[PDB]
């Protein structure tokens, strides 16, 4: 199938409570595999999935140096951004970055990503061409000029098309038994009356990986988007995810309702009904 790798950086100021905390986590698809936390007793890159443990000390030291240097630069960046928005030194602020590469089913580069946010709003993003930037406001334009002057995009491109793809392929191979295994949802439908004349039908999907899934109710074959209660896909803690969709139906009309499930792990999309 298709696969992606992403690093997620969070730098958070906290005036009066020390220097800004920097965390970095790395993912392949929905699997975290590394973390670094400047607040750890002894800050260093730590493995978070078994298939990455085989990497040698050189790998871990390389990662740690990268994250330590970034820790320092992000503190400078926070200072710079507080100034770009004329903000007081009293408040706490957050820069976030997420970046990485997507591979198609044949293992070739589909596209790269490098996006940043400040206090939870789009700030600056590398365009799909990996050569130009989109700045969200006049502050991000200052960053854009600075990054253009320094040929930053060129460096991001070289990484996204080069090492990012190369290492993602390495991890996909080393962790093939899990990273390249899709586990289908285990599904069922529950029924409980809400009153004399109405009942809830709930369609469950459990144990699936990756998280991407489609779960819908149909009445007489028509989508019931508006009347369906759909919870956010949620992690079980064993790598897998869970989700349900519920609809309230007129007692007796249960068989007019069908639940449809699409997931990568499924050969054909499933259709389910309540089975008394």
């Amino acid at each position: 199938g298709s696969h992606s790798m992403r690093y997620f950086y969070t730098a958070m100021s906290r005036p009066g409570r020390g220097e800004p905390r920097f965390i970095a986590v790395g993912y392949v698809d929905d699997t975290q595999f590394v973390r670094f936390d400047s607040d750890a007793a002894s800050p260093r890159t730590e493995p978070r999935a078994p298939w990455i443990e085989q990497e040698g000390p050189e790998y871990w030291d390389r990662n740690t140096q990268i994250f330590k240097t970034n820790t320092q630069t992000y503190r400078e960046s926070l200072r710079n951004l507080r100034g770009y928005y004329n903000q007081s030194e009293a408040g706490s602020h957050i820069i976030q970055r997420m970046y990485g590469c997507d591979l198609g089913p044949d293992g070739r580069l589909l596209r790269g990503h490098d996006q940043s946010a400040y206090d939870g709003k789009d700030y600056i993003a590398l365009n799909e061409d990996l050569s130009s930037w989109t700045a969200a406001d006049t502050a991000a334009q200052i960053t854009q000029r600075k990054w253009e002057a320094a040929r930053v995009a060129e460096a991001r491109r070289a990484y996204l098309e080069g090492l990012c793809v190369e290492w993602l392929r390495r991890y996909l191979e080393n962790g093939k038994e899990t990273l390249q295994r899709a586990d289908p949802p285990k599904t069922h439908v529950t029924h409980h009356p809400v009153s004399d004349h109405e009942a809830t039908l709930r369609c469950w999907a459990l144990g699936f990986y990756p998280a991407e899934i489609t779960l819908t109710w149909q009445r007489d074959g028509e989508d019931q988007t508006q009347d369906t209660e759909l919870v956010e896909t949620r992690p079980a803690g064993d790598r897998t995810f869970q989700k349900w969709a519920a609809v309230v139906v007129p007692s007796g009309e249960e068989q007019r309702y069908t639940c449809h499930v699409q997931h990568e792990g499924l050969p054909k999309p499933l259709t389910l009904r309540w089975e008394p």
């Binding site: 690093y7 990662n63 990268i66 630069t73 400078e76 960046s77 991001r156």
Partner: peptide
């Protein structure tokens, strides 16, 4: 692997 450091200094925002 995360983005490696450049030869020079890392460019801040």
């Amino acid at each position: 692997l995360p983005e490696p450091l450049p030869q020079g200094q890392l460019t801040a925002y």
